[PDB]
Design a protein around this motif. Structure first.
Motif, PDB file in Angstrom:
ATOM      1  N   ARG A 146     -25.976  23.760  72.935  1.00  0.00           N
ATOM      2  CA  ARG A 146     -25.324  22.286  72.795  1.00  0.00           C
ATOM      3  C   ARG A 146     -24.621  21.849  74.082  1.00  0.00           C
ATOM      4  O   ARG A 146     -23.516  22.425  74.217  1.00  0.00           O
ATOM      5  N   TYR A 190     -33.328  13.286  70.974  1.00  0.00           N
ATOM      6  CA  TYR A 190     -31.928  14.209  70.797  1.00  0.00           C
ATOM      7  C   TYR A 190     -31.028  13.326  70.165  1.00  0.00           C
ATOM      8  O   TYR A 190     -30.667  12.197  70.951  1.00  0.00           O
ATOM      9  N   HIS A 226     -27.101  13.051  70.338  1.00  0.00           N
ATOM     10  CA  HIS A 226     -25.968  13.634  71.030  1.00  0.00           C
ATOM     11  C   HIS A 226     -24.805  13.843  70.203  1.00  0.00           C
ATOM     12  O   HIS A 226     -24.136  14.762  69.989  1.00  0.00           O
ATOM     13  N   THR A 227     -24.432  12.653  69.567  1.00  0.00           N
ATOM     14  CA  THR A 227     -23.260  12.656  68.692  1.00  0.00           C
ATOM     15  C   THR A 227     -23.142  11.805  67.731  1.00  0.00           C
ATOM     16  O   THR A 227     -24.021  10.810  67.730  1.00  0.00           O
ATOM     17  N   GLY A 236     -27.041  17.069  67.654  1.00  0.00           N
ATOM     18  CA  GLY A 236     -27.284  18.504  68.263  1.00  0.00           C
ATOM     19  C   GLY A 236     -28.580  18.659  67.857  1.00  0.00           C
ATOM     20  O   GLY A 236     -29.068  19.892  68.224  1.00  0.00           O
TER      21      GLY A 236
END
Ligand code: NI
Ligand SMILES: [Zn+2]
Ligand SMILES: [Zn+2]
Length: 478
Positions: free
Chosen positions: A54, A219, A221-222, A285
């Motif tokens: 990560r 992806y 990320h958060t 993640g």
């Protein structure tokens, strides 16, 4: 405003989920290639990185998180299916947008993923009231910054550097050896340089397919999860037809609706019409992989920040070819030069074969290139197909045309990297070989054709991929 008693969650089977090892993640392209046999028939798949993989997120630093501004657009969720574009919204920072997402959720819902899904589709399918949300989409990571770390000289060694070198870092994925996008010199936004998406609750990316039917890697990320729906590539056509048949006609005002990306259609309706839909829940993640010509859509469950980029392994080439042909029939502009990428791959492979001739060290890259160029090799098939197309087109004209050794078609916007027909009367204006006659109306004496490679040179390229040392020697010199 939330009404859980009238939830409208569709019954969608889950897309496959994969758990690659560390070794598997050491080689992104190979792993994608292996994932193809298992998941291409679904259209999309979820990929969970190995434990403890990560990367740190530079966007979380307060110089960006608190002070960096991005524009938003307004989505009316209640109008996405039953009813046009997304209007300008206010400017946000990530902090401000997260704050507003919190505010919104607390007001709205006074909640797990499936509740959110049920309510979302309740709003879309049978709206009681108007629901508007903001979406920060297609943000360019060049100005704002990437969610992935970058290497910075003059610092102590950290894990961040290793993450910055990683192939699964979306900044590096597009131009990895094996991806033909490496032969495009321009840092094309979205295609080669990743785009950033900042979402809030109910933020929607409608039904669409990638430009040139490329692979898409995303992806998270958060932030909160993102719900994905995907259609297998081999059913693309079907989907399209259903879109024309279940919203007749939101295809009148605008025959070009599919590519406007402002229309949502429930997986329920798609299932009743016989189109297979698959579901994935992407959490922070994690990766989402999208295959060639696979329609996908979805929505956000709250504040989040995602990054997306394209990739083009050799097995995409066929699809790619088809795509541009389609574009030519659609009179739609391309986003890249296909022939440039194809030729680039061919020349790289030829160079590797030539290196094998001189008994140079056999590397994994050289091996990979070699295994896709024999008589049965995918690259060879792509190149040969293209060359045959050129021969046929050439035969159809050049009745006095004349040729010159070395840009879009004026009519169908076909990219003219390989060849371009023009005339004396109209310089600086070109046509593809299909519409060579449609250009002017002048006599043959004034017509002519810009050509990058003679036909025998191209056939020589085909032979070189098949392993003729003289042809290999020839093309290695280019
Ligand atoms: Ni997409
Ligand atoms: Zn044309
Ligand atoms: Zn002319």
């Amino acid at each position: 405003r939330w009404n859980p008693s009238e939830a409208c969650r569709p019954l969608v089977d889950d897309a496959p989920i994969f758990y690659p090892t560390n070794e598997d993640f050491d080689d992104p392209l190979g792993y994608i290639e292996k994932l193809r046999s298992k998941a291409e028939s679904y259209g999309i798949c979820r990929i969970v990185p190995p434990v403890a993989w990560r990367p740190p997120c530079p966007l979380k630093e307060k110089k960006i998180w608190e002070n960096s501004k991005f524009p938003t657009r307004i989505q009316f969720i209640d109008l996405l299916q039953n009813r046009f574009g997304f209007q300008t919204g206010p400017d946000f920072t990530l902090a401000a947008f997260q704050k507003y997402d919190e505010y919104f959720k607390e007001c709205y819902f006074q909640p797990k993923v499936k509740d959110l899904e049920g309510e979302y589709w309740r709003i879309v399918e049978q709206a009681t009231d108007e629901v508007e949300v903001y979406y920060g989409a297609d943000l360019e990571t060049k100005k704002f910054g990437s969610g992935f770390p970058k290497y910075k000289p003059g610092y102590p060694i950290s894990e961040a550097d290793q993450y910055s070198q990683c192939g699964w870092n979306l900044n590096n994925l597009s131009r990895l050896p094996g991806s033909v996008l490496a032969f495009e010199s321009c840092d094309i936004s979205g295609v080669i340089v990743p785009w950033l998406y900042v979402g809030m609750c109910f933020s929607t990316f409608c039904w669409h397919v990638e430009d040139h039917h490329l692979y898409s890697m995303n992806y998270l990320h958060t932030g909160d999860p993102k719900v994905w729906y995907g259609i297998p590539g081999n059913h693309a056509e079907s989907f399209e037809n259903v879109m024309k048949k279940r919203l007749p006609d939101l295809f009148e005002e605008q025959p070009d609706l599919l590519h406007q990306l402002v229309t949502q259609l429930s997986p329920r309706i798609l299932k009743e019409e016989g189109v297979p839909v698959y579901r994935a829940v992407q959490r922070s993640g994690e990766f989402i992989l999208t295959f060639p010509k696979a329609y996908h859509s979805g929505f956000n469950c709250g504040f989040n920040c995602a990054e997306a980029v394209n990739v083009a392994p050799v097995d995409w080439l066929v699809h790619g070819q088809n795509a541009v042909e389609g574009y030519s029939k659609q009179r739609r502009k391309s986003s890249l030069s296909h022939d440039k990428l194809l030729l680039g791959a061919a020349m790289e492979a030829t160079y590797c074969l030539w290196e094998l001739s001189l008994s140079k060290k056999k590397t994994p890259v050289i091996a990979r290139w070699k295994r896709v160029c024999s008589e049965d090799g995918l690259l060879t098939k792509a190149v040969k197909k293209r060359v045959q197309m050129e021969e046929e087109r050439l035969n159809h004209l050049q009745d006095g045309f004349s040729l010159r050794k070395m840009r879009e078609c004026f009519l169908c916007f076909y990219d003219l990297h390989m060849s371009a027909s023009s005339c004396k009367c109209s310089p600086n204006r070109f046509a593809c070989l299909i519409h060579a006659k449609d250009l002017c109306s002048c006599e043959s004496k004034d017509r002519y054709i810009l050509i990058r490679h003679t036909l025998d040179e191209l056939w020589a390229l085909v032979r070189a991929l098949e392993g003729d040392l003289d042809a290999i020697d020839l093309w290695a010199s280019k």
